[model samples]
Target: KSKVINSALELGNEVGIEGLTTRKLAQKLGVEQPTLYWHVKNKRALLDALAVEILARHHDYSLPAAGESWQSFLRNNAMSFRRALLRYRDGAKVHLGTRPDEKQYDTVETQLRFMTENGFSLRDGLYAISAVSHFTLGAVLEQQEHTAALTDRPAAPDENLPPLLREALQIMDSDDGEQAFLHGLESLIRGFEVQLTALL
Candidate 1:
């Protein structure tokens, strides 16, 4: 099972999700198609599994350290998840529509419980989780797409542009989304903090 999961990630990276097929996976695995079919019903099943396992296996910051502030815990967790998604081709897309596997229920519960205990209402806690995830996903998708454009369609550096725009691009070029990602992460956490404070 682990072999198939790893191979799927390998092939998925080699040829984006659109090109990943059971036949191709079998070809790479040096096994027959039926064997794979027995384990994973179809392409969607493979993708779903990839979405869950990719995080389970790679995103390491599962829970808060003892007595850690909610803000700190969320920042660490978000960074961990962002890197995990950045590790694969279409990684954010892989996570876009999939639900977490039941195995993650306990971990999810603990995270939410931590939030509530730290001053968030349950609904607000859910919002914080969703907002951070979507924000991270959006950032990664833009970064990946920007990377793809640079690689697949190289731009001519000589092209003319506004001085302000060029300066902005120059600054951004030096940062591979680090400052941008953290800025949003911090803002969201601070925003949540404000919300929590008002209700307390």
Candidate 2:
């Protein structure tokens, strides 16, 4: 089972996740396709296992330390999550398809506990964490797509764009994925602070 899972990950990275198949994985492992199915039921299950495989690698490093600010904790977590995704080809896409239950349960629980202890309601803690998680997933997916593009030259910005649109295009033209991601992270954190103000 471990061999099946490990081989799948290595092969999945070489061929994009979408391109990976049980038959192909079996060939890579020098075993019959049925051997893999015995361990992972189907594509979704395999992906779920793979998601845990990659995410678990980050858990030890991503966990918040005692006395760290919730803001730093979340930012560190998201960045660590992003790094893990970037480690494998098509990782964000594969990760987005997973629920990652057992492996991620403690991480989620501890994050929620930290938020509630810092004055957030249980509901707000969930939403706030989800906001950052969803943002990181979406942002990394977009970054991956942009990186995977065969051509370097994207379409030129429209000259007739409105002032705000023009400004956005200008920023897009100067795109730095990491900087943009951090800016978005900062904004999401500020939004939670604003929400906390009303509840206080």
Candidate 3:
């Protein structure tokens, strides 16, 4: 079963899931389409399998270790997730908005545990979890687009835009963007704490 699923994911890596098909998969596996069908019922099911494989291959989403603050644990968790999405071709696009409960729920479970341990109310936990997920996906997608657009040297900031944006662009050129992500994530987590405090 893993052979078939791995083969399908490999095809997706090469040609993308949209270009993936039962016939193409059969060709890749050196088996007939019906034989491939024995493992995956249909194309959608195969996509789900690929999504599951992609996520599970990268993130285990286990319980955090003792003494790990919720903030530190989650930021590292998000970084791992972003790296995982970057692994396959069109990987982020393939996994985006798919069946979250299927395999990705492991991360959700971990988040739930993290929030509960950190003294977050259930409602706060849910909102904060959703915000973190949204932020992660948005950040990953932005990075993917930025990488695709950057074919030449680093970008120059437009003088026509505000001075702050230009200064920010210059700063953006200096280092890997991970620092900015961490800063933003920390700010978001801090804001969530403030929000939770207000709620309580």
Candidate 4:
């Protein structure tokens, strides 16, 4: 099934997500459209599969380690999530509205249970990871857009641009958002720690 997935992934890289269609994917797989439809059904379903598979294949920090703190687990998972999204063209876009397919709930339970074991209620644990996910997605959306725009440049430092924005663009050009993400993650963790302390 993931053979179909990774193939669609490759095709989407060339065609972009909007360009990925069942007919073209069938051609890519040497299967008829019906055959492909039997597996993936439509562009929406295909995107959902790609979204989950990309993370499952790429995200490594699925479980908390023997001595790993909840903060560390989230930091590792969110960083890995960001990297996975950044790995493919429009990868973050592919994930934008897609869901974790049904089977991954087993893995989801373990992740949430770890948080519960560490003092968070189930809802709070979900909220924490949801915040992490939302932040990562927003960060990657900006990063991918900035990166794609830069494809048309080596951008000139324009005198017409304001100093603040000039510096902003310069920072975007020089780094891949790594520094900002880490600092933000640290803040997020600190906030969660404070919240959990108060709740207890």
Candidate with maximal TM-score: 1
Off by over 4 Å in 4: 151-157, 160-163
Question: How would you encode candidate 3's per-residue C-alpha lDDT over 57-164 as one tens digit per residue?
Answer: 886543566788877777777777777777787677767677565455765677787787678887788787677767877777777668766887476547578988
What pairs collide in candidate 2? Answer: none
* Candidate 2 per-residue C-alpha lDDT over 71-162 given as tens digits, one digit per residue, 9 for 90 to 100: 88988888888888888888888888566488578877888899999999999998998898899999989888877883876775586789
Highest-lDDT candidate? 1
**lDDT value, residue 61 of candidate 1:** 94
lDDT of 4 by residue, 53-120 (tens): 88887877777889899999999989889989988888899988665678788888989999999999
Clashes of 3: 0
Q: Rank the candidates by TM-score, best first.
A: 1, 4, 2, 3
Model 4 root mean square deviation, Cα atoms: 2.1
How well is each residue in 97-151 modelled by candidate 1, as lDDT tens digits?
7766898889999999999998889999999998999999999999998988886
Query: Where is the poorest 10-residue window by lDDT in model 3?
Result: 99-108
Q: Each model's RMSD to truth, in Å?
A: 1.8, 2.4, 3.3, 2.1
How far off is residue 125 in model 3, in Å?
Answer: 0.9
Model 4 residue-pair collision total: 0
The collision pairs in model 1 are none
Q: Lowest summed-lDDT stretch of 10 residues in model 1?
A: 151-160
Off by over 4 Å in 2: 59-61, 152-170, 173-175
Q: What lDDT is obtained when candidate 1 is compared to the true structure?
A: 0.90
